[PDB]
Structure 1
Amino acid sequence: EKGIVEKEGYQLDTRRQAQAAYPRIKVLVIHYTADDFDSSLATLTDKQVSSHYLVPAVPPRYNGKPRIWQLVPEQELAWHAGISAWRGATRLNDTSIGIELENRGWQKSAGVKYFAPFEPAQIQALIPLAKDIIARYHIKPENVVAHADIAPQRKDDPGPLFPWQQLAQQGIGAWPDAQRVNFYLAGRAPHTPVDTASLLELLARYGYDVKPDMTPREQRRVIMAFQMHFRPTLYNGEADAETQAIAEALLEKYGQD
């Protein structure tokens, strides 16, 4: 009937819709696989981890379009985030979509952890899928994140070679206004040392997991995670003026929720 639904035991009347109704999905998490396509597909369909999408390094094309693998209906959670925290939330699996990108990650080469560049074909395939996802759920720019952002002590992915600024120019994810980063730099050289505690407060509020008593090591991983995303020219995890100014400009533009 007119807005009425039948069931075993009861009728539902759907005629009155509440104003306060919002997606359960709020977060888009970017990963790399650190493994080849067939191997990643095997792993992400097994019983320990999964993701909603798997993008090959160079997706095959059909009907003039890159093909991407969907492993898990978006309505359902995938096992991609693990133990995690972002902007007040935990258990990020519950509220996120996870995209896995076939990419080798890091390999230590004479002690120097070297990351692998992202195939431009892959990024090109990613853009329309991210846009559709972001439209569908009205995902806010600051909630397009790296796995490292939501689990900084455990993960680096997708790493400092991931083109966040390029994506931001396509309307995908958060990026600070350059004039405001300069404003907050406030006359300092970019690498001028800044007070670690003060920087960590800002990162906490922007959304990073920061606990009251952390070893220097653990404080470095948080700052490093932030730099890999937002200041990838140097991601050694030391608090400096440029890192702080970026955090300050991000907070000004996107807030904290």
Structure 2
Amino acid sequence: EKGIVEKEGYQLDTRRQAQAAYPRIKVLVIHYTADDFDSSLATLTDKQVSSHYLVPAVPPRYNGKPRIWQLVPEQELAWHAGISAWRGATRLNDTSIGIELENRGWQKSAGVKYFAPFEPAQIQALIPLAKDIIARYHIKPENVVAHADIAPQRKDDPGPLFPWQQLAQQGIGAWPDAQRVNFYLAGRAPHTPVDTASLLELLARYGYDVKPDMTPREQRRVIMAFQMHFRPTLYNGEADAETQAIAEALLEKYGQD
């Protein structure tokens, strides 16, 4: 009958549905390819790495719409996150969708690591795709993340030129309330030094992989990753009052779950 599924050696009665049923997909990870489109496509379809989506630097338009490549069905995991951790989860491939953005990433120029700006055409294509994914799985804003957020010791992508605040204004990803940032500054100048351990606690709670007995460099990488996402005007990895205030405002607004 209705709600009865015939199988080989048994039948399934589907008439009673549990309330506790949730998506396995909880996180959306943003990457850059550090490579041109064709080479990125070749890599992302090889035996070692993949992503669910690949967005050209300037997507071609057909039928009045930008074209985006889908390489892996969303129901399956892609191999995009590697060793990773976010808000208490590990193995983020298992519970994420990975979007690759064609973009050069960083290139050293007189020794300075300089990042490549994202073209507006690419961001404008990304926006509806991201909104569709977020709506489909009820992804929380704090779970739209940089690869660097989940693997801070290893990765920088999508880096300090990625327009997170713009995307937040369009309903994609977390951003603190300006008045609350000012509140947590508590009269301090933005670059006033802060107890490093105090900041690392906040970042651990927001979701960054923080362990006991980290070296100074490891400590710097976590703070830098956070700054690249949320305080991109200065990502030297040094704990200051503004970086702390942003973490405090994020935690107040989005919690730790």
Task: Give me the TM-score of the superposition, normalised by structure 2.
Answer: 1.00
Partners of 2:192 and 2:231 in 1: how far apart?
Answer: 14
Offset of 1:225 from its aligned partner?
0.1
Offset of 1:183 from its aligned partner?
0.2
Offset of 1:29 from its aligned partner?
0.1
> What SS does structure 2 have at the residue aligned with 1:93?
helix
For structure 2, the residue ranges without an aligned partner over 5 or more in a row are none
Matches within 5 A, 1:159-198: 159-198=159-198
Partners of 2:131 and 2:167 in 1: how far apart?
Answer: 10
Offset of 1:201 from its aligned partner?
0.3
Could you list the per-position Cα deviations for residues 99-124 of structure 1 after superposition, in whole angstroms to 9, with x for gaps in the alignment?
Answer: 00000000011111000000000000
Partners of 2:213 and 2:35 in 1: how far apart?
Answer: 35
Offset of 1:73 from its aligned partner?
0.1
Partners of 1:222 and 1:8 in 2: how far apart?
Answer: 52
Offset of 1:98 from its aligned partner?
0.1
Could you list the per-position Cα deviations for residues 11-30 of structure 1 after superposition, in whole angstroms to 9, with x for gaps in the alignment?
Answer: 00000000000000000000
Offset of 1:141 from its aligned partner?
0.2
Count of equivalent residues: 257
> What SS does structure 2 have at the residue aligned with 1:43?
helix
> What SS does structure 2 have at the residue aligned with 1:94?
helix
Could you list the per-position Cα deviations for residues 29-67 of structure 1 after superposition, in whole angstroms to 9, with x for gaps in the alignment?
Answer: 000000000000000000010000000000000000000
1:254 aligned residue = 254
Partners of 1:193 and 1:80 in 2: how far apart?
Answer: 36
Offset of 1:209 from its aligned partner?
0.2
Partners of 2:120 and 2:49 in 1: how far apart?
Answer: 26
Offset of 1:150 from its aligned partner?
0.0
Q: Which runs of 4+ in 1 moved over 2 A?
A: none
Offset of 1:212 from its aligned partner?
0.3
Could you list the per-position Cα deviations for residues 59-99 of structure 1 after superposition, in whole angstroms to 9, with x for gaps in the alignment?
Answer: 00000000000000000000000000000000000000000
Offset of 1:214 from its aligned partner?
0.6
Partners of 1:76 and 1:160 in 2: how far apart?
Answer: 30
2:90 aligned residue = 90
Partners of 2:211 and 2:70 in 1: how far apart?
Answer: 35
Partners of 1:33 and 1:14 in 2: how far apart?
Answer: 43
Partners of 1:226 and 1:92 in 2: how far apart?
Answer: 18
Could you list the per-position Cα deviations for residues 202-232 of structure 1 after superposition, in whole angstroms to 9, with x for gaps in the alignment?
Answer: 0000000001011100000000000000000
Partners of 2:213 and 2:62 in 1: how far apart?
Answer: 53
> What SS does structure 2 have at the residue aligned with 1:242?
helix
> What SS does structure 2 have at the residue aligned with 1:99?
strand
> What SS does structure 1 have at the residue aligned with 2:145?
strand
Partners of 1:111 and 1:253 in 2: how far apart?
Answer: 38
Could you list the per-position Cα deviations for residues 132-155 of structure 1 after superposition, in whole angstroms to 9, with x for gaps in the alignment?
Answer: 000000000000000000000000
2:245 aligned residue = 245
Alignment RMSD, CA only?
0.3
Partners of 2:54 and 2:213 in 1: how far apart?
Answer: 37
> What SS does structure 2 have at the residue aligned with 1:67?
strand
Partners of 2:89 and 2:180 in 1: how far apart?
Answer: 28
Partners of 1:176 and 1:193 in 2: how far apart?
Answer: 21
> What SS does structure 1 have at the residue aligned with 2:166?
helix
Task: Give me the TM-score of the superposition, normalised by structure 1.
Answer: 1.00
Offset of 1:2 from its aligned partner?
1.2
2:9 aligned residue = 9
> What SS does structure 1 have at the residue aligned with 2:94?
coil
Partners of 1:226 and 1:110 in 2: how far apart?
Answer: 25
> What SS does structure 2 have at the residue aligned with 1:181?
helix
